[PDB]
Amino acid sequence: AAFGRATHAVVRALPESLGQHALRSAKGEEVDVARAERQHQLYVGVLGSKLGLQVVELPADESLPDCVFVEDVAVVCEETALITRPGAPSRRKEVDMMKEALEKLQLNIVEMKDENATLDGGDVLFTGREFFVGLSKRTNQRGAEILADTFKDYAVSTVPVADGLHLKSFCSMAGPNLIAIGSSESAQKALKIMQQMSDHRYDKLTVPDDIAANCIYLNIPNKGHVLLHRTPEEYPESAKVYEKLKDHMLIPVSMSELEKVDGLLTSCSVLINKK
Ligand SMILES: CCCCC(=N)NCCC[C@H](N)C(=O)O
Numbered sequence: 001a002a003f004g005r006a007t008h009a010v011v012r013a014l015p016e017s018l019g020q021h022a023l024r025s026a027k028g029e030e031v032d033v034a035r036a037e038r039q040h041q042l043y044v045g046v047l048g049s050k051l052g053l054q055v056v057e058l059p060a061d062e063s064l065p066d067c068v069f070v071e072d073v074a075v076v077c078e079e080t081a082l083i084t085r086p087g088a089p090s091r092r093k094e095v096d097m098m099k100e101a102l103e104k105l106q107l108n109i110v111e112m113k114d115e116n117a118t119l120d121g122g123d124v125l126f127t128g129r130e131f132f133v134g135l136s137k138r139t140n141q142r143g144a145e146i147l148a149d150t151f152k153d154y155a156v157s158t159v160p161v162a163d164g165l166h167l168k169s170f171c172s173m174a175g176p177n178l179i180a181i182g183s184s185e186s187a188q189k190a191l192k193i194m195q196q197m198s199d200h201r202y203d204k205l206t207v208p209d210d211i212a213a214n215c216i217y218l219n220i221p222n223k224g225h226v227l228l229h230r231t232p233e234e235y236p237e238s239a240k241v242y243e244k245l246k247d248h249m250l251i252p253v254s255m256s257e258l259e260k261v262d263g264l265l266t267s268c269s270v271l272i273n274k275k
Pocket residue numbers: 022023024025066069072088120122123165166168169214261262263264266267
């Protein structure tokens with residue numbers, strides 16, 4: 001049971017209302033809810049059917065157009081689960097079915113209650129040795145402060161995330177000591193700020209497309225290193241970079257439709273490691 005090892009993943013059906021009410025930073029083209037289902041279906045298929053991860057499929061709630069991006073409502077570290085208080089208000093009630101699910105999974109629950117503390121899981125990078133909470137439009141001091149308190153086993157440092165981005169809008173773990181990072185000067189700056197406050201040097205996998213830096217690494221047994229990345233079709237110059245890693249079983253995964261509403265790969269699931 002090494003870094004990135006999981007046995008379970010929590011997912012949640014996306015509601016029909018996401019099509020027109022899901023919060024979105026940029027005004028893009030219309031969201032084809034149907035394709036989103038297809039994409040989301042395959043996404044869970046990879047985690048469960050293909051990687052054997054026991055998947056818990058929370059039902060969709062129409063009133064919570066963002067219930068599908070479960071990673072923002074909770075952060076699980078080893079055996080302890082931290083239900084967050086989303087940076088967005090209209091997303092606060094997603095905690096209910098999530099605390100419900102983690103409870104059923106016998107995880108130590110620690111709820112973020114503080115009326116002045118916001119934290120979206122998307123702003124949190126668990127390198128497997130420490131945490132990196134992005135302070136953004138969604139996450140503040142108290143957020144990281146409470147999270148740091150919840151995981152006293154690990155060092156927690158905060159890094160400034162500008163605009164409507166989240167820390168993981170440009171990075172994520174692509175493996176042990178491997179931090180996937182975007183080329184943007186803003187991306188590279190955020191990164192540098194990170195390692196300065198660390199004791200160990202992380203190897204970095206730089207990708208031209210900043211959002212492609214968002215991916216999923218997994219240490220699945222009989223497989224080894226697993227990395228679900230954005231497909232060549234969606235980001236060829238970034239996909240070509242992931243292609244050079246021969247020690248990782250590379251599984252392309254499209255997310256264009258949900259990306260229309262700021263939803264990336266990591267966003268769609270919570271990975272628990274129940275041993
Ligand atoms: C890798 C994280 C990217 C940002 C993020 N939390 N994405 C998922 C949430 C999207 C949702 N529409 C929101 O406005 O919160």
